[PDB]
Amino acid sequence: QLTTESMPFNVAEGKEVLLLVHNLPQQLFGYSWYKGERVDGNRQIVGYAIGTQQATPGPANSGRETIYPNASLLIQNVTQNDTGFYTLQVIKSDLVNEEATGQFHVY
Amino acid sequence: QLTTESMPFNVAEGKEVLLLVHNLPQQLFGYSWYKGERVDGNRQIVGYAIGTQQATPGPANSGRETIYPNASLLIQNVTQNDTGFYTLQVIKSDLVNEEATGQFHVY
Numbered sequence: 001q002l003t004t005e006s007m008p009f010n011v012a013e014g015k016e017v018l019l020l021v022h023n024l025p026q027q028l029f030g031y032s033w034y035k036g037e038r039v040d041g042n043r044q045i046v047g048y049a050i051g052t053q054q055a056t057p058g059p060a061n062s063g064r065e066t067i068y069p070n071a072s073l074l075i076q077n078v079t080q081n082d083t084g085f086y087t088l089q090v091i092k093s094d095l096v097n098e099e100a101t102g103q104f105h106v107y
Numbered sequence: 108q109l110t111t112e113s114m115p116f117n118v119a120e121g122k123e124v125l126l127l128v129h130n131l132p133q134q135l136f137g138y139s140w141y142k143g144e145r146v147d148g149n150r151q152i153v154g155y156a157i158g159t160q161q162a163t164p165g166p167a168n169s170g171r172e173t174i175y176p177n178a179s180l181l182i183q184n185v186t187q188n189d190t191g192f193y194t195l196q197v198i199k200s201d202l203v204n205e206e207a208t209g210q211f212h213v214y
């Protein structure tokens with residue numbers, strides 16, 4: 001049910017892309033975004049804690065990424081290296097968590 | 108830094124194994140264990156929420172697994188099909204999370 005949608009899916013080099021998030025579970029503690037197809041701390045872009053309303057960069061943050069309170073992710077000034085897969089994890093209040101994988105293509 | 112240790116590493120069929128967790132981070136929301144080498148909600152054994160002090164089974168829970176408040180995981184009555192990889196994820200309060208993959212061998 002949890003899914004992502006890239007706006008736009010095909011992104012011109014140097015422009016921006018917004019990863020929209022649909023069907024968020026109801027009771028959430030926070031969000032974590034990753035580069036790639038896997039939840040992997042070594043590739044985490046950002047973590048967002050809902051109660052403190054706080055965004056914290058992970059190792060893959062480049063200074064171009066913004067996360068919003070509804071879990072959408074904005075990436076500015078995209079490069080060819082940003083192309084491909086991104087994985088969102090949402091942390092539910094029972095710690096039985098959910099993932100969704102999105103994608104965009106820079107040309 | 109976060110590591111697991113199988114106690115014992117070689118486990119006789121039908122006996123039990125305790126996955127000890129070392130180097131846990133200080134500020135945490137909870138823990139999640141998975142069967143396999145990936146964080147994947149479809150293979151989640153258990154989620155443990157520190158604030159409500161509650162364990163919640165995931166799809167891979169079989170009734171044989173117990174998680175402790177220090178994140179250690181006890182699996183009773185192992186079979187040869189249980190051998191291999193298990194993954195712990197620790198959810199930090201800033202949502203910059205950490206993983207460790209452990210392993211044991213059933214003989």
Ligand SMILES: *[C@@H]1O[C@H](CO)[C@@H](O)[C@H](O)[C@H]1NC(C)=O
Nearest residue numbers: 014062063064065076077078
């Ligand atoms: C994106 O690139 C433009 C043009 O170089 C620059 O003005 C802007 O600050 C950049 N944005 C970020 C977040 O670095």
Ligand SMILES: *[C@@H]1O[C@H](CO)[C@@H](O)[C@H](O)[C@H]1NC(C)=O
Nearest residue numbers: 020021022068069070071072
């Ligand atoms: C999430 O919030 C952003 C920023 O306000 C907004 O642009 C976007 O439409 C929202 N997402 C959804 C699915 O409504």
Ligand SMILES: *[C@@H]1O[C@H](CO)[C@@H](O)[C@H](O)[C@H]1NC(C)=O
Nearest residue numbers: 127128129175176177178179
């Ligand atoms: C975690 O708690 C369990 C149960 O009290 C204990 O057996 C185990 O030794 C603990 N793990 C560590 C690393 O202290």
